[PDB]
C-alpha cells in the first residue's frame, strides 16, 4: 500500500494533522506506527490515524 483511501472523516485538531474526507486517496509516505500514518492528500501533508483508511493501490 503506497496509496490508501479514507473511509471515515478525520477532523484535524492539531497542526501537522492531515484531515480526511471519505473517498480521499492519500499518498502513504510512512507507516509511523500501527496507529499513526504520514501521507499527503490534495497538496497537504500530515499525519492521520491508520484505522481511518483502507488500501487503494
Can you describe what's shown?
This protein has strands spanning 3-6, 25-31, 36-41, 44-49, 53-55. The protein is mainly β and 57 residues long. It has a five-stranded antiparallel β-sheet, with no helix packed on it. It is globular.
Order of helices and strands: EEEEE
Beta-strand content: over 45%
Number of helices: 0
> For the CA atoms, what is the radius of gyration?
10 Å
| Main sheet record | 5 strands, antiparallel
Helix and strand content put the structural class at mainly beta
Termini, distance in Å? 6 Å
What fold name stands as the CATH topology?
Answer: SH3 type barrels
Number of domains: 1
Number of strands: 5
Overall geometry comes to: globular
The CATH homologous superfamily corresponds to SH3 Domains
Helix fraction? under 10%
Strands across the major sheet, in which order?
A: 4-3-2-1-5
Task: State the name of the first-level CATH class.
Answer: Mainly Beta
Assign the CATH architecture. Answer: Roll
PDB class: protein binding
Keywords: SH3 domain, Protein binding
Assembly: monomeric
Entry title: SH3 domain of yeast Pin3
Amino acid at each position: 500500500m503506497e496509496y490508501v483511501e479514507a473511509l471515515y472523516q478525520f477532523d484535524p485538531q492539531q497542526d501537522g494533522d492531515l484531515g480526511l474526507k471519505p473517498g480521499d486517496k492519500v499518498q502513504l509516505l510512512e507507516k509511523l506506527s500501527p496507529e499513526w500514518y504520514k501521507g499527503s492528500c490534495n497538496g497537504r501533508t500530515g499525519i492521520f490515524p491508520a484505522n481511518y483508511v483502507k488500501p487503494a493501490f
